[PDB]
């Protein structure tokens, strides 16, 4: 029926910076060779695709974006062996080819096939399966998931479960397997320790999640939005704390707080002054501190390396350092297995034609993630 | 015939920066309630003591610098239960009082009681031993071994073994343990792994030293001063490069050399731009980059984030990560098991007469380390 063919299909195109995503009309090519052709069922709003929009992340414009989310192979292209027409699957921002050497690694996780340091908002083969208006558009993180049909190479894309609950799942494309495994992989949080997260949207939860599973004593949320507070506590915050109410510099008081500095700090906004105060502010010879947060394009932050000299551990990681298609699956199961819940993360739903909706819901503040549903 | 009493001994006192030390008399008071007076056998000269000179490292004048060192107990004070007159010591710049939450805790070494973050050149009572024309000087680190006698406290001081040669072993105080631990404990080296040393000096070497002992398949050495290379090539560098000898900057051409990025880059220099050249120079998603060189006081480095937010580790370290009394004498018996050398570290061995000789040795380029001898 669709196989082979062109495909025309609604989607929210981005033209330029700053400016409402537009609803229309989109042409789809057929998958070529290792490439998958998805049937899109939900897709979540992560921060990061209003960085586009914002300019923080600069990737090719006009564009599709959209890459956390879920959907239903409708065809397969020449050579594709691990998805088949029908699977449930989710995108991976962040591929995994399996030849790199970062595949590889026994740690590492940044594919060097990604399209994140240096975007061309491409297929791996370096051209475009969208048309709109007679113009080429650009892909993003080689998932453009805002749109009815996408097309994504292979080693951009996990089967899933055929069970699993598409309008929840799409959050282990992106949001809550990055703050998850920020904790539990990439900072490798202790028992009895004591964390602070800095940033309490769907990212930050799920690193307080992550936290929590990792059996800390206490973790302590700093929002300047205080009516994140609550939701941060019902996933596992013990404290939350507000920069603005104090008269001191944040670090000050959080170092009070854990009696001389925490054990595991995370920044998961995106602001320069935020990633240096979150090292500041774990102890000074064994404390780790991890950013998550994306920072706007091509800006320096200023520190002093005495915080490093004295013992302190500053990493970052993309997508919770999980080796994407390997571990998307195995987290779903996980899900399917209620080892972790999705639900606190879901505060609005709403079909996929008001995506403009849902964008003012996250930079207004009121939502965690609006899922959107095709 | 000492103990109880004043000694008046010789002593360099630095009385401002920027000038020649001063070899003249001092005064040495008797050890107090859990102090010990150490009669000096040999000092070694660390760039960290010349940083004194020149200002990079700010601490109070004037002084008795000199931490790298080894002698022989003369007294001790009420109290004392860990060394007795008459035994070999190593004095330590990092106390370990085995008390505080950085010495419970087992990674953790910059013991709380240090002299370093805010530095005030005193015993840990807030008071000074040393007299020089009827004027107080200052302690450094809580060593001031450029004396033939010195007052630590008795968590700056740990006992070696009895037959041990003090005019070698006085490295394990600093420059040797600093190296070899950022590598072997800092780091945690690879077998296998691709290492870029920056600072081909005392500590670098040791540094190398650390990495050809964890199993490094290639160590490259960067200098500025090419008459470097063949010791570090001796102590197990497998290729040096000098970044004046290259139209790129050296975090390219070391990318370049590595196939995309080495397994762990080392700052072992003290500037600002080597600290973020060393980050850089690591694979983006999985490299470790450890900062051991002291950067110029209050100064910050510049660096993108998007370094980190891509997977790789930074960190700093003082000692190498060894708990200071806890490691020196297991170290000093590593020695003398022939585990690890330390002649190639020694170019020469001056009277303590010729301290600022020494200095002119290490300045001018033409030594690793002088050994003063008392
Ligand atoms: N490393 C990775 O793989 C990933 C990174 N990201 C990045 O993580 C960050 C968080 O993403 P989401 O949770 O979706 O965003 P979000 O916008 O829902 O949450 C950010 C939170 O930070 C708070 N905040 C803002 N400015 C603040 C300040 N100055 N001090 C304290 N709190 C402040 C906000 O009130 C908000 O609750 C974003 O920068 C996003 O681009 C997201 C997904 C994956
Ligand atoms: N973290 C810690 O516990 C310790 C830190 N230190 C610090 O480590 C650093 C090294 O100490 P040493 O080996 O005693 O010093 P050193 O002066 O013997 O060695 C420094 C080396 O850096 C090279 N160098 C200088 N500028 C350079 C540049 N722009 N590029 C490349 N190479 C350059 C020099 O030619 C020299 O060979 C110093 O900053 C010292 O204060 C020393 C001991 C302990
Ligand atoms: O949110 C998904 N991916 C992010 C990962 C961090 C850099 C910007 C893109
Ligand atoms: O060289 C010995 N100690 C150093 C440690 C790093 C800060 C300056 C002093
Ligand atoms: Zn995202
Ligand atoms: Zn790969
Ligand atoms: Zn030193
Ligand atoms: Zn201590």
Same mark, same amino acid.
């Given at each position: 029926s669709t196989a082979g063919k062109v495909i025309k299909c609604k989607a929210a195109v981005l033209?330029?910076?700053k400016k409402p995503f537009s609803i229309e009309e989109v042409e789809v090519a057929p998958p070529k060779a290792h490439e998958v052709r998805i049937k899109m069922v939900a897709t979540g709003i992560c921060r990061s695709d209003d960085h586009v929009v914002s300019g923080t992340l600069v990737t090719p414009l006009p564009v599709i974006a959209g890459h956390e989310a879920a959907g239903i192979v409708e065809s397969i292209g020449e050579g594709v062996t691990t998805v088949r027409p029908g699977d449930k699957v989710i995108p991976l921002g @962040?591929?995994?080819?399996?030849?790199?050497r970062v595949c590889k690694?026994?740690?590492?996780?940044?594919?060097?096939?990604? #399209?994140?340091?240096?975007?061309?908002? @491409?297929m791996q083969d370096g051209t475009s399966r969208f048309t709109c208006r007679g113009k080429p558009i650009h892909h993003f993180?080689? @998932?453009?998931?805002?749109? /009815?049909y996408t097309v994504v190479d292979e080693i951009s894309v996990a089967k899933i479960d055929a069970a699993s609950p598409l309008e929840k799942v799409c959050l282990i494309g992106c949001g809550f397997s990055t703050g998850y495994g920020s904790a539990?992989?990439?900072?490798?949080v202790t028992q009895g320790s004591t964390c602070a997260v800095f940033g309490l949207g769907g990212v930050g939860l799920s690193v307080i999640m992550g936290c929590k599973a990792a059996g800390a004593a206490r973790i302590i949320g700093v929002d *300047?939005?205080?009516?994140? !507070?609550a939701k941060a506590k019902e996933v596992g915050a013990t404290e939350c704390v507000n920069? /603005? #109410?104090?008269?001191?510099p944040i670090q000050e008081v959080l170092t009070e707080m854990s009696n001389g500095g925490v054990d595991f700090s995370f920044?998961? *906004?995106?602001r320069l002054d935020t990633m240096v105060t979150a090292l500041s502010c774990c102890q000074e010879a064994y404390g780790v501190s991890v950013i998550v947060g994306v920072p706007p394009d091509s800006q320096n932050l200023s520190m002093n390396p005495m915080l490093l000299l004295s013992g302190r551990t500053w990493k970052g990681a993309i997508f919770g350092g999980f080796k994407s298609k390997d571990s998307v699956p195995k987290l779903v199961a996980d899900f399917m297995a209620k080892? !972790?819940?999705?639900?606190?993360? *879901?505060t609005h739903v709403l079909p996929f034609e008001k995506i403009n909706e849902g964008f003012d819901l996250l930079r207004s503040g009121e939502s965690i993630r609006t899922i959107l549903t095709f």
């Amino acid at each position: 029926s669709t196989a082979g063919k062109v495909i025309k299909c609604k989607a929210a195109v981005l033209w330029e910076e700053k400016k409402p995503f537009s609803i229309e009309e989109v042409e789809v090519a057929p998958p070529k060779a290792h490439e998958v052709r998805i049937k899109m069922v939900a897709t979540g709003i992560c921060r990061s695709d209003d960085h586009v929009v914002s300019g923080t992340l600069v990737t090719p414009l006009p564009v599709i974006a959209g890459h956390e989310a879920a959907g239903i192979v409708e065809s397969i292209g020449e050579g594709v062996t691990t998805v088949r027409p029908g699977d449930k699957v989710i995108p991976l921002g @962040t591929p995994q080819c399996g030849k790199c050497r970062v595949c590889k690694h026994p740690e590492g996780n940044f594919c060097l096939k990604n #399209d994140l340091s240096m975007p061309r908002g @491409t297929m791996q083969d370096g051209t475009s399966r969208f048309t709109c208006r007679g113009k080429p558009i650009h892909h993003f993180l080689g @998932t453009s998931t805002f749109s /009815q049909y996408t097309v994504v190479d292979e080693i951009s894309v996990a089967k899933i479960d055929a069970a699993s609950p598409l309008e929840k799942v799409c959050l282990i494309g992106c949001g809550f397997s990055t703050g998850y495994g920020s904790a539990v992989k990439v900072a490798k949080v202790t028992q009895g320790s004591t964390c602070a997260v800095f940033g309490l949207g769907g990212v930050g939860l799920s690193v307080i999640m992550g936290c929590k599973a990792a059996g800390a004593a206490r973790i302590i949320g700093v929002d *300047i939005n205080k009516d994140k !507070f609550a939701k941060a506590k019902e996933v596992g915050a013990t404290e939350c704390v507000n920069p /603005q #109410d104090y008269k001191k510099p944040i670090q000050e008081v959080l170092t009070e707080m854990s009696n001389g500095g925490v054990d595991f700090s995370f920044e998961v *906004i995106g602001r320069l002054d935020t990633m240096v105060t979150a090292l500041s502010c774990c102890q000074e010879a064994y404390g780790v501190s991890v950013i998550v947060g994306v920072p706007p394009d091509s800006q320096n932050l200023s520190m002093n390396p005495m915080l490093l000299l004295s013992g302190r551990t500053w990493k970052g990681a993309i997508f919770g350092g999980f080796k994407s298609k390997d571990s998307v699956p195995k987290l779903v199961a996980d899900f399917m297995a209620k080892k !972790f819940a999705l639900d606190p993360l *879901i505060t609005h739903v709403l079909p996929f034609e008001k995506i403009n909706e849902g964008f003012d819901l996250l930079r207004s503040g009121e939502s965690i993630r609006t899922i959107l549903t095709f």
